Amino acid sequence: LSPYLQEVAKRRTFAIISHPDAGKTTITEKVLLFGQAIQTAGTVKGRGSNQHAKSDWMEMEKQRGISITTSVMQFPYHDCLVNLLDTPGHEDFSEDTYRTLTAVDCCLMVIDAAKGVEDRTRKLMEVTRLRD
Amino acid sequence: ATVNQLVRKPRARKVAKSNVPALEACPQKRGVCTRVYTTTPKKPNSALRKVCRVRLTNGFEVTSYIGGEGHNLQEHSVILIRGGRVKDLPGVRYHTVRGALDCSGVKDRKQARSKYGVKRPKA
């Protein structure tokens, strides 16, 4: 329990994947208020929940349409220090997501319960089993 | 004439006038190129000289010659003008550099390619 192996063991670095328009980016914004990084919160496209609070979709065009490339996050939850990724949904668009998986030790898949399992959901599991 | 006179109203030099005043008296200039026309030269000669009216960067708009047989230029484009007049077409006091910015060098030219901008074709 030296100050080194302690810092190491209390860390946890993960993905967040799914099929386009599932909930990545939203569940992420919410994970951020459970980490005291965002004192309020928002939505997406800065939409239905008002206030110029969208957010944390880096870029710009993202806020015009809907999501582009992996934003990365570090915050403290409970006894841990989480490193959070935000993987883009779209066939042509990424790439990147795949390379991003290379930085995660584990992974969380969001599923639209109104849609079930969609196309890039199935394709993402294949990519996942590559690294068990 | 007289010293006293020269002493008084002293001799005054007569400044020179740059035949090419598309400002700054600088190497060359970038220009938007307003139109791409062709005209006829003075009495002795008779061709269909190619020219373009270019909106320089400094605001002056000016007509320039397109040296070489054929060019890619048209409507918009963005040539870069040089200097040297075109004693055959008056008003044409500038030459657009070939193979610079939006301008394509003369296709196939093999002699004195430094001008007309072209690269050594398979030595």
Partner: protein
């Protein structure tokens, strides 16, 4: 919050990454990161690029000296980013499992392994090849760098990559999947006030970017040069019309790949 409780409770501490040398334990000391991404760098006052590194083992500390295994050149670190949510932050010192940012100047690529000395490279990282189309020919009737500069700055990133033939103009871009739109959009966001549109271009390949022994290459860089291109990063590439004209090209032979390398 449950799924988070579940996250904290069950999910792995930093894991071992494989290399062509050994199983690299997270527990080890001696810093060992590996990049993995050079994010779509806008970015508020710089080209930055800031390569995103994973940190497999060892503790990073601000003034430490590291070794870029690939280029085999030892590099001292000072400005090493810590990303507080899509936002640069200064800067601290890191432990395995975190994500660190650097500063790409044609020195970093994708899968560039950094150690404290151990010459070895992480067997991971995908890096696949683009399809194509394009010819951004720009409204804004030029400039010309900002467009190009924009393109030779979105290209040391992993998504796309440009292609500029030996005719100065004729700019080709290729080509993640088909979202050639972020390009247009980053052509009037990020830090370039260009506009830009498209066309169709007689290019199937992709291409594939070659080099090996001398003289022979200079005979190659000549014969099929028509036809030959050069990239942002100052090398190399061909650009073909179809598959048959791709095969015959390589078939000129026998000098090297294939090569994509992003």
């Amino acid at each position: 919050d449950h799924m988070l409780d579940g996250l904290v409770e069950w999910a792995p501490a930093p894991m071992p990454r494989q290399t062509d040398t050994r199983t690299v334990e997270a527990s080890e000391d001696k810093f060992t990161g590996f990049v993995f991404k050079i994010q779509a760098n806008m970015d508020p006052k710089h080209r930055d690029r800031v390569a995103f590194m994973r940190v497999v083992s060892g503790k990073y500390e601000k003034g430490m000296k590291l070794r870029q295994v690939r280029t085999a050149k030892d590099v001292v670190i000072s400005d090493a980013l810590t990303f507080m949510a899509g936002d640069r932050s200064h800067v601290e010192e890191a432990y395995p499992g975190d994500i660190l940012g650097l500063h790409n100047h044609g020195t970093i690529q994708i899968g560039d392994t950094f150690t404290q000395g151990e010459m070895m490279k992480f067997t991971g990282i995908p890096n696949f090849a683009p399809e194509l189309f394009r010819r951004i020919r720009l409204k804004d009737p030029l400039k010309q760098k900002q467009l190009l500069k924009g393109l030779v700055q979105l290209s040391e990133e992993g998504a796309v990559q440009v292609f500029r033939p030996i005719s100065n103009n004729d700019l080709i871009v290729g080509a993640v999947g088909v979202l050639q739109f972020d390009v247009v959009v980053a052509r009037l966001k990020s830090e370039y006030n260009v506009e830009a549109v498209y066309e169709s271009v007689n290019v199937a390949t992709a291409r594939w970017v070659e080099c090996a022994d001398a003289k022979k290459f200079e005979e190659f860089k000549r014969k099929n040069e028509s036809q030959l291109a050069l990239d942002g990063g100052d090398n190399l590439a061909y650009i073909a019309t179809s598959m048959v004209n791709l095969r015959l090209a390589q078939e000129r032979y026998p000098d090297v790949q294939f090569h994509q390398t992003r």
